[PDB]
UniProtKB/Swiss-Prot annotation:
Cell compartments where the protein resides: Secreted
Lineage: Eukaryota, Fungi, Dikarya, Basidiomycota, Agaricomycotina
Organism (species): Phanerodontia chrysosporium
GO terms of molecular function: heme binding; manganese peroxidase activity; metal ion binding
Cited function: Catalyzes the oxidation of Mn(2+) to Mn(3+). The latter, acting as a diffusible redox mediator, is capable of oxidizing a variety of lignin compounds.
Similarity-based family: Belongs to the peroxidase family. Ligninase subfamily.
Catalytic activities: 2 Mn(2+) + H2O2 + 2 H(+) = 2 Mn(3+) + 2 H2O
GO cellular component: extracellular region
Ligand binding (heme b): 173
Residues that coordinate or bind Ca(2+) 1: 47, 62, 64, 66
Cofactor(s) recorded in Swiss-Prot or TrEMBL: Ca(2+); heme b
Annotated EC: 1.11.1.13
Gene Ontology biological-process annotations: cellular response to oxidative stress; hydrogen peroxide catabolic process; lignin catabolic process; response to reactive oxygen species
Full protein name: Manganese peroxidase 1
Keyword Disulfide bond belongs to the record: yes
The encoding gene: MNP1
Length: 357
Protein backbone atom coordinates (compact mmCIF):
# COMPACT_ATOMS: atom_id res chain seq x y z
CA UNK A 1 0.00 0.00 0.00
CA UNK A 2 0.91 3.64 -0.43
CA UNK A 3 0.41 5.72 2.71
CA UNK A 4 -0.82 9.31 2.55
CA UNK A 5 2.74 10.55 2.92
CA UNK A 6 3.86 8.57 -0.09
CA UNK A 7 5.55 5.77 1.84
CA UNK A 8 5.09 2.36 0.25
CA UNK A 9 4.37 -0.24 2.96
CA UNK A 10 3.47 -3.90 3.43
CA UNK A 11 -0.16 -3.35 4.46
CA UNK A 12 -2.33 -0.26 4.55
CA UNK A 13 -3.04 -0.83 8.25
CA UNK A 14 0.62 -0.12 8.95
CA UNK A 15 0.37 3.39 7.53
CA UNK A 16 -0.77 5.06 10.74
CA UNK A 17 2.37 3.89 12.50
CA UNK A 18 4.49 6.20 10.32
CA UNK A 19 3.32 9.56 11.72
CA UNK A 20 3.20 7.89 15.14
CA UNK A 21 6.91 7.08 14.98
CA UNK A 22 7.64 10.59 13.77
CA UNK A 23 5.63 12.13 16.61
CA UNK A 24 7.26 9.90 19.23
CA UNK A 25 10.72 10.84 17.95
CA UNK A 26 10.07 14.60 17.75
CA UNK A 27 8.16 14.81 21.04
CA UNK A 28 9.65 12.44 23.59
CA UNK A 29 12.76 10.62 22.25
CA UNK A 30 14.51 13.11 19.88
CA UNK A 31 16.20 10.13 18.26
CA UNK A 32 18.20 9.49 21.45
CA UNK A 33 18.51 6.34 23.57
CA UNK A 34 17.92 8.61 26.54
CA UNK A 35 15.77 8.88 29.63
CA UNK A 36 12.41 8.93 27.88
CA UNK A 37 13.50 6.08 25.56
CA UNK A 38 14.64 4.07 28.60
CA UNK A 39 11.32 4.56 30.41
CA UNK A 40 9.24 3.46 27.44
CA UNK A 41 11.38 0.38 26.90
CA UNK A 42 10.80 -0.64 30.52
CA UNK A 43 7.04 -0.03 30.03
CA UNK A 44 6.95 -2.47 27.09
CA UNK A 45 8.16 -5.19 29.42
CA UNK A 46 5.92 -4.34 32.42
CA UNK A 47 2.89 -4.08 30.11
CA UNK A 48 3.63 -7.38 28.39
CA UNK A 49 4.74 -9.61 31.29
CA UNK A 50 1.59 -9.09 33.44
CA UNK A 51 -0.02 -12.33 32.34
CA UNK A 52 -0.14 -15.82 33.92
CA UNK A 53 -0.87 -19.16 32.30
CA UNK A 54 -1.53 -20.71 35.67
CA UNK A 55 -3.85 -18.05 37.08
CA UNK A 56 -5.84 -17.61 33.87
CA UNK A 57 -6.95 -14.58 31.88
CA UNK A 58 -8.46 -12.76 34.87
CA UNK A 59 -4.96 -12.16 36.22
CA UNK A 60 -3.85 -10.15 33.18
CA UNK A 61 -3.99 -9.90 29.40
CA UNK A 62 -0.26 -9.55 28.62
CA UNK A 63 0.78 -6.97 25.96
CA UNK A 64 -2.65 -5.34 26.04
CA UNK A 65 -2.03 -1.70 26.93
CA UNK A 66 -3.50 -2.25 30.43
CA UNK A 67 -0.99 0.18 31.88
CA UNK A 68 -2.43 2.99 29.70
CA UNK A 69 -6.09 1.94 29.86
CA UNK A 70 -6.09 1.52 33.66
CA UNK A 71 -3.44 4.06 34.60
CA UNK A 72 -4.40 4.19 38.26
CA UNK A 73 -4.15 0.44 38.97
CA UNK A 74 -0.92 -1.33 37.91
CA UNK A 75 1.36 1.76 37.82
CA UNK A 76 0.66 2.12 41.55
CA UNK A 77 1.75 -1.40 42.48
CA UNK A 78 5.07 -1.19 44.31
CA UNK A 79 6.85 -3.35 41.68
CA UNK A 80 5.78 -0.81 39.05
CA UNK A 81 7.29 2.19 40.92
CA UNK A 82 8.53 4.78 38.37
CA UNK A 83 6.43 3.47 35.49
CA UNK A 84 3.97 6.36 35.87
CA UNK A 85 6.12 8.77 33.82
CA UNK A 86 6.14 6.49 30.73
CA UNK A 87 2.40 5.87 30.95
CA UNK A 88 1.67 9.59 31.26
CA UNK A 89 4.02 10.24 28.31
CA UNK A 90 2.24 7.75 26.00
CA UNK A 91 -1.41 8.49 26.89
CA UNK A 92 -1.41 11.73 24.83
CA UNK A 93 -0.30 9.68 21.79
CA UNK A 94 -3.06 7.12 22.40
CA UNK A 95 -5.57 9.99 22.37
CA UNK A 96 -4.16 11.67 19.29
CA UNK A 97 -3.14 8.65 17.20
CA UNK A 98 -6.55 7.19 17.82
CA UNK A 99 -6.62 4.51 15.21
CA UNK A 100 -3.87 2.56 17.01
CA UNK A 101 -4.70 0.53 20.12
CA UNK A 102 -3.01 1.29 23.45
CA UNK A 103 -1.45 -2.18 23.26
CA UNK A 104 0.04 -1.66 19.80
CA UNK A 105 1.13 1.86 20.83
CA UNK A 106 3.13 0.50 23.78
CA UNK A 107 4.91 -2.19 21.75
CA UNK A 108 5.66 0.05 18.79
CA UNK A 109 6.90 2.90 21.01
CA UNK A 110 9.30 0.39 22.62
CA UNK A 111 10.54 -0.60 19.18
CA UNK A 112 11.05 3.04 18.17
CA UNK A 113 12.88 3.86 21.38
CA UNK A 114 15.19 0.86 21.02
CA UNK A 115 16.06 1.82 17.45
CA UNK A 116 17.77 4.95 18.89
CA UNK A 117 20.27 2.81 20.86
CA UNK A 118 23.35 1.93 18.79
CA UNK A 119 23.68 -1.80 18.34
CA UNK A 120 19.99 -2.56 18.98
CA UNK A 121 18.10 -4.90 16.67
CA UNK A 122 15.16 -3.74 14.57
CA UNK A 123 12.38 -5.44 16.45
CA UNK A 124 9.61 -7.37 14.78
CA UNK A 125 6.43 -5.39 15.12
CA UNK A 126 3.06 -7.08 14.63
CA UNK A 127 -0.09 -4.98 14.87
CA UNK A 128 -3.78 -5.51 15.60
CA UNK A 129 -3.98 -6.07 19.34
CA UNK A 130 -7.43 -5.06 20.57
CA UNK A 131 -8.05 -1.79 22.45
CA UNK A 132 -10.00 -3.29 25.35
CA UNK A 133 -8.73 -5.34 28.27
CA UNK A 134 -8.74 -5.52 32.10
CA UNK A 135 -6.35 -4.24 34.73
CA UNK A 136 -3.83 -6.89 35.74
CA UNK A 137 -3.37 -8.22 39.24
CA UNK A 138 -0.36 -7.49 41.49
CA UNK A 139 2.62 -9.85 41.86
CA UNK A 140 3.25 -10.50 38.16
CA UNK A 141 6.27 -8.20 37.68
CA UNK A 142 9.69 -9.62 38.57
CA UNK A 143 11.54 -7.65 41.27
CA UNK A 144 15.31 -7.22 41.76
CA UNK A 145 15.24 -8.89 45.22
CA UNK A 146 13.70 -12.03 43.74
CA UNK A 147 15.64 -15.30 43.53
CA UNK A 148 16.58 -16.85 40.18
CA UNK A 149 14.12 -19.70 40.79
CA UNK A 150 11.32 -17.15 41.35
CA UNK A 151 12.32 -15.11 38.30
CA UNK A 152 12.63 -18.11 35.98
CA UNK A 153 9.27 -19.40 37.22
CA UNK A 154 7.59 -16.02 36.64
CA UNK A 155 8.80 -15.94 33.03
CA UNK A 156 7.85 -19.54 32.38
CA UNK A 157 4.39 -18.93 33.87
CA UNK A 158 3.97 -15.73 31.86
CA UNK A 159 4.74 -17.16 28.43
CA UNK A 160 6.88 -20.31 28.26
CA UNK A 161 10.16 -18.33 28.27
CA UNK A 162 13.30 -20.41 28.65
CA UNK A 163 16.24 -19.27 30.83
CA UNK A 164 18.08 -18.39 27.59
CA UNK A 165 15.23 -16.11 26.56
CA UNK A 166 15.09 -14.53 30.01
CA UNK A 167 18.77 -13.58 30.03
CA UNK A 168 18.40 -12.48 26.39
CA UNK A 169 15.71 -9.98 27.39
CA UNK A 170 18.03 -8.67 30.08
CA UNK A 171 20.22 -7.24 27.31
CA UNK A 172 17.85 -4.28 27.85
CA UNK A 173 19.80 -3.56 31.05
CA UNK A 174 22.56 -2.41 28.62
CA UNK A 175 20.44 0.77 28.20
CA UNK A 176 18.90 1.16 31.61
CA UNK A 177 19.07 3.21 34.78
CA UNK A 178 17.47 3.15 38.26
CA UNK A 179 15.66 6.00 39.99
CA UNK A 180 13.71 4.12 42.65
CA UNK A 181 16.02 1.44 44.00
CA UNK A 182 17.97 3.98 46.00
CA UNK A 183 16.02 7.06 46.93
CA UNK A 184 19.10 9.25 47.45
CA UNK A 185 20.34 9.09 43.86
CA UNK A 186 18.72 9.20 40.43
CA UNK A 187 19.55 7.66 37.09
CA UNK A 188 22.08 5.09 38.34
CA UNK A 189 23.08 3.17 35.19
CA UNK A 190 23.34 -0.64 35.06
CA UNK A 191 26.41 -0.48 32.73
CA UNK A 192 28.93 2.20 31.77
CA UNK A 193 27.25 2.86 28.41
CA UNK A 194 23.51 3.24 29.22
CA UNK A 195 22.93 4.99 25.88
CA UNK A 196 24.51 2.14 23.86
CA UNK A 197 22.97 -1.28 23.29
CA UNK A 198 26.26 -3.17 23.70
CA UNK A 199 27.39 -6.16 25.79
CA UNK A 200 28.98 -4.08 28.59
CA UNK A 201 26.32 -4.98 31.17
CA UNK A 202 27.15 -8.67 30.76
CA UNK A 203 30.83 -7.99 31.39
CA UNK A 204 30.41 -5.44 34.17
CA UNK A 205 28.04 -7.46 36.30
CA UNK A 206 30.78 -10.12 36.42
CA UNK A 207 33.31 -7.73 38.07
CA UNK A 208 33.87 -7.79 41.86
CA UNK A 209 31.79 -5.07 43.52
CA UNK A 210 33.73 -2.36 45.35
CA UNK A 211 31.12 0.08 46.65
CA UNK A 212 27.64 1.54 46.10
CA UNK A 213 26.60 4.53 43.96
CA UNK A 214 24.37 5.79 46.80
CA UNK A 215 23.62 4.01 50.07
CA UNK A 216 24.59 0.45 50.96
CA UNK A 217 21.32 -0.86 52.29
CA UNK A 218 18.73 -0.88 49.49
CA UNK A 219 16.48 -3.84 48.77
CA UNK A 220 17.28 -5.48 45.44
CA UNK A 221 20.77 -3.95 45.19
CA UNK A 222 24.27 -5.36 45.61
CA UNK A 223 27.77 -3.83 45.45
CA UNK A 224 28.80 -2.16 42.17
CA UNK A 225 32.19 -2.35 40.42
CA UNK A 226 31.97 1.30 39.27
CA UNK A 227 30.24 3.15 42.13
CA UNK A 228 31.89 6.56 41.59
CA UNK A 229 29.56 9.42 40.76
CA UNK A 230 29.80 13.20 40.69
CA UNK A 231 27.15 15.90 40.19
CA UNK A 232 24.46 14.27 38.06
CA UNK A 233 26.81 11.57 36.66
CA UNK A 234 25.56 8.87 39.02
CA UNK A 235 27.72 5.83 39.56
CA UNK A 236 26.86 2.36 38.25
CA UNK A 237 24.23 0.34 40.16
CA UNK A 238 24.05 -3.47 40.34
CA UNK A 239 20.72 -5.28 40.80
CA UNK A 240 20.71 -8.43 43.00
CA UNK A 241 18.74 -10.22 40.28
CA UNK A 242 21.29 -9.47 37.51
CA UNK A 243 24.10 -10.53 39.86
CA UNK A 244 22.20 -13.67 40.81
CA UNK A 245 21.51 -14.59 37.21
CA UNK A 246 25.17 -14.10 36.28
CA UNK A 247 26.29 -16.64 38.90
CA UNK A 248 23.46 -19.22 39.14
CA UNK A 249 24.27 -22.57 37.49
CA UNK A 250 21.17 -22.36 35.33
CA UNK A 251 22.07 -19.09 33.69
CA UNK A 252 25.79 -18.38 34.30
CA UNK A 253 27.03 -19.68 30.94
CA UNK A 254 24.24 -17.92 29.07
CA UNK A 255 25.11 -14.68 30.84
CA UNK A 256 28.81 -15.02 30.01
CA UNK A 257 27.99 -16.09 26.44
CA UNK A 258 26.85 -12.56 25.60
CA UNK A 259 30.07 -10.83 26.80
CA UNK A 260 31.73 -9.43 23.65
CA UNK A 261 29.17 -11.11 21.43
CA UNK A 262 27.19 -8.13 20.15
CA UNK A 263 25.41 -9.72 17.18
CA UNK A 264 24.50 -12.80 19.17
CA UNK A 265 23.13 -10.63 21.96
CA UNK A 266 21.10 -8.44 19.63
CA UNK A 267 19.67 -11.38 17.61
CA UNK A 268 18.78 -13.23 20.83
CA UNK A 269 17.08 -10.13 22.26
CA UNK A 270 15.10 -9.65 19.06
CA UNK A 271 13.97 -13.27 19.18
CA UNK A 272 12.86 -13.01 22.83
CA UNK A 273 11.15 -9.65 22.29
CA UNK A 274 9.23 -11.12 19.35
CA UNK A 275 7.66 -13.51 21.91
CA UNK A 276 7.25 -10.90 24.67
CA UNK A 277 5.50 -8.40 22.41
CA UNK A 278 2.66 -10.78 21.63
CA UNK A 279 1.95 -12.18 25.10
CA UNK A 280 -1.86 -12.47 25.48
CA UNK A 281 -2.33 -12.90 21.71
CA UNK A 282 -2.09 -15.45 18.89
CA UNK A 283 0.66 -14.11 16.64
CA UNK A 284 -1.21 -15.62 13.66
CA UNK A 285 -3.94 -13.08 14.33
CA UNK A 286 -1.67 -10.01 14.13
CA UNK A 287 -0.56 -8.34 10.91
CA UNK A 288 3.15 -7.78 10.16
CA UNK A 289 4.08 -4.12 10.32
CA UNK A 290 7.81 -4.63 10.87
CA UNK A 291 8.69 -2.48 7.85
CA UNK A 292 7.51 0.66 9.61
CA UNK A 293 9.85 0.18 12.60
CA UNK A 294 12.70 2.72 12.16
CA UNK A 295 16.09 1.20 11.13
CA UNK A 296 18.27 1.07 14.22
CA UNK A 297 21.48 3.04 14.76
CA UNK A 298 24.36 0.64 14.00
CA UNK A 299 27.03 -0.21 16.58
CA UNK A 300 30.56 1.02 15.96
CA UNK A 301 31.64 -2.64 15.91
CA UNK A 302 34.23 -2.28 18.70
CA UNK A 303 34.76 -5.21 21.10
CA UNK A 304 33.71 -5.00 24.71
CA UNK A 305 36.42 -3.58 27.01
CA UNK A 306 37.11 -3.39 30.74
CA UNK A 307 36.38 0.16 31.95
CA UNK A 308 39.31 1.92 33.58
CA UNK A 309 39.88 0.90 37.22
CA UNK A 310 38.89 -2.69 36.34
CA UNK A 311 40.56 -5.65 34.70
CA UNK A 312 40.52 -9.46 34.29
CA UNK A 313 41.75 -9.96 37.82
CA UNK A 314 38.42 -8.49 39.04
CA UNK A 315 36.34 -11.18 37.30
CA UNK A 316 34.07 -13.42 39.34
CA UNK A 317 33.50 -16.22 36.86
CA UNK A 318 30.83 -18.92 37.05
CA UNK A 319 30.80 -20.85 33.75
CA UNK A 320 33.18 -23.84 33.79
CA UNK A 321 32.66 -24.88 30.17
CA UNK A 322 33.25 -21.70 28.18
CA UNK A 323 36.42 -19.62 27.92
CA UNK A 324 36.09 -15.97 28.98
CA UNK A 325 37.21 -13.79 26.05
CA UNK A 326 40.43 -11.79 25.86
CA UNK A 327 39.46 -8.13 26.18
CA UNK A 328 41.48 -4.90 26.38
CA UNK A 329 41.18 -2.40 29.23
CA UNK A 330 40.54 1.32 28.85
CA UNK A 331 43.59 3.24 29.99
CA UNK A 332 43.59 5.14 33.29
CA UNK A 333 44.11 4.32 36.96
CA UNK A 334 40.78 5.49 38.29
CA UNK A 335 37.12 5.18 37.26
CA UNK A 336 35.71 7.53 34.65
CA UNK A 337 32.38 9.15 35.41
CA UNK A 338 29.44 7.71 33.50
CA UNK A 339 27.88 10.63 31.57
CA UNK A 340 24.34 11.54 32.61
CA UNK A 341 23.58 12.71 29.03
CA UNK A 342 23.92 11.09 25.60
CA UNK A 343 26.06 13.95 24.25
CA UNK A 344 28.41 13.79 27.21
CA UNK A 345 27.02 16.50 29.45
CA UNK A 346 24.88 16.42 32.54
CA UNK A 347 22.08 18.68 31.25
CA UNK A 348 19.47 16.96 29.04
CA UNK A 349 16.01 17.05 30.62
CA UNK A 350 13.45 14.62 29.20
CA UNK A 351 10.07 15.86 27.95
CA UNK A 352 7.48 14.78 30.53
CA UNK A 353 3.70 15.10 30.37
CA UNK A 354 1.50 15.18 33.48
CA UNK A 355 -1.20 12.52 33.43
CA UNK A 356 -3.43 10.23 35.48
CA UNK A 357 -0.79 7.66 36.45
C1 LIG B 1 14.38 -10.38 36.28
C2 LIG B 1 14.00 -9.31 35.38
C3 LIG B 1 14.11 -7.94 35.57
C4 LIG B 1 14.09 -7.23 36.72
C5 LIG B 1 13.93 -7.71 38.16
C6 LIG B 1 14.33 -5.85 36.36
C7 LIG B 1 14.46 -4.83 37.29
C8 LIG B 1 14.74 -3.49 37.02
C9 LIG B 1 14.86 -2.43 37.99
C10 LIG B 1 14.64 -2.60 39.49
C11 LIG B 1 14.87 -1.26 37.30
C12 LIG B 1 15.13 0.13 37.86
C13 LIG B 1 13.86 0.98 37.93
C14 LIG B 1 14.04 2.17 38.86
O1 LIG B 1 14.28 2.01 40.07
O2 LIG B 1 13.99 3.31 38.33
C15 LIG B 1 14.86 -1.60 35.89
C16 LIG B 1 15.12 -0.71 34.84
C17 LIG B 1 15.04 -1.02 33.49
N1 LIG B 1 14.68 -2.26 33.00
FE1 LIG B 1 14.55 -3.96 34.01
N2 LIG B 1 14.21 -5.70 34.99
C18 LIG B 1 14.21 -6.99 34.48
C19 LIG B 1 13.82 -7.27 33.18
C20 LIG B 1 13.64 -6.28 32.20
C21 LIG B 1 13.36 -6.57 30.81
C22 LIG B 1 13.04 -7.98 30.31
C23 LIG B 1 13.41 -5.41 30.13
C24 LIG B 1 12.95 -5.10 28.85
C25 LIG B 1 13.07 -5.92 27.67
C26 LIG B 1 13.83 -4.40 31.08
C27 LIG B 1 14.27 -3.11 30.72
C28 LIG B 1 14.64 -2.12 31.62
C29 LIG B 1 14.93 -0.75 31.25
C30 LIG B 1 14.92 -0.17 29.84
C31 LIG B 1 15.19 -0.09 32.40
C32 LIG B 1 15.62 1.36 32.52
C33 LIG B 1 14.49 2.30 32.91
C34 LIG B 1 15.02 3.73 33.02
O3 LIG B 1 16.24 3.91 32.80
O4 LIG B 1 14.23 4.61 33.38
N3 LIG B 1 14.06 -4.98 32.31
N4 LIG B 1 14.81 -2.97 35.75
C1 LIG C 1 -8.61 3.04 22.80
O1 LIG C 1 -9.17 3.32 24.10
C2 LIG C 1 -8.87 4.62 24.57
C3 LIG C 1 -9.47 4.76 25.96
O2 LIG C 1 -10.87 4.61 25.85
C4 LIG C 1 -9.45 5.65 23.57
O3 LIG C 1 -9.03 6.93 24.05
C5 LIG C 1 -9.89 8.04 23.92
O4 LIG C 1 -9.68 8.58 22.63
C6 LIG C 1 -10.44 9.73 22.31
C7 LIG C 1 -10.10 10.06 20.86
O5 LIG C 1 -10.46 8.98 20.01
C8 LIG C 1 -10.22 10.84 23.33
O6 LIG C 1 -11.15 11.89 23.09
C9 LIG C 1 -10.42 10.33 24.77
O7 LIG C 1 -10.09 11.32 25.71
C10 LIG C 1 -9.57 9.08 25.02
N1 LIG C 1 -9.91 8.46 26.29
C11 LIG C 1 -9.09 8.45 27.34
C12 LIG C 1 -9.66 7.96 28.66
O8 LIG C 1 -7.93 8.86 27.26
C13 LIG C 1 -8.86 5.46 22.17
O9 LIG C 1 -9.46 6.37 21.26
C14 LIG C 1 -9.03 4.00 21.71
N2 LIG C 1 -8.27 3.82 20.48
C15 LIG C 1 -8.75 3.04 19.51
C16 LIG C 1 -7.83 2.67 18.36
O10 LIG C 1 -9.89 2.57 19.59
C1 LIG D 1 37.73 8.40 32.31
O1 LIG D 1 38.12 9.07 33.52
C2 LIG D 1 39.08 8.42 34.33
C3 LIG D 1 39.41 9.39 35.48
O2 LIG D 1 38.32 9.59 36.34
C4 LIG D 1 40.33 8.04 33.52
O3 LIG D 1 41.15 7.22 34.32
C5 LIG D 1 39.99 7.31 32.22
O4 LIG D 1 41.14 7.13 31.42
C6 LIG D 1 38.93 8.09 31.42
O5 LIG D 1 39.50 9.28 30.92
CA1 LIG E 1 -0.53 -5.45 30.36
CA1 LIG F 1 25.31 -0.38 27.42
Amino acid sequence: AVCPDGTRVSHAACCAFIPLAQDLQETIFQNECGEDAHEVIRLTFHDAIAISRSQGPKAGGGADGSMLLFPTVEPNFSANNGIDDSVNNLIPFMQKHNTISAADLVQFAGAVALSNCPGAPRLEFLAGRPNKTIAAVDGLIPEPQDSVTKILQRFEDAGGFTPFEVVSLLASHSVARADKVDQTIDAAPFDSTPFTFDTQVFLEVLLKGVGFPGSANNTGEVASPLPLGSGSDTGEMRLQSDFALAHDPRTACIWQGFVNEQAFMAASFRAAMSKLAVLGHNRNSLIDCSDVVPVPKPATGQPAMFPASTGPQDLELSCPSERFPTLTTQPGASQSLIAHCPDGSMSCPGVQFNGPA
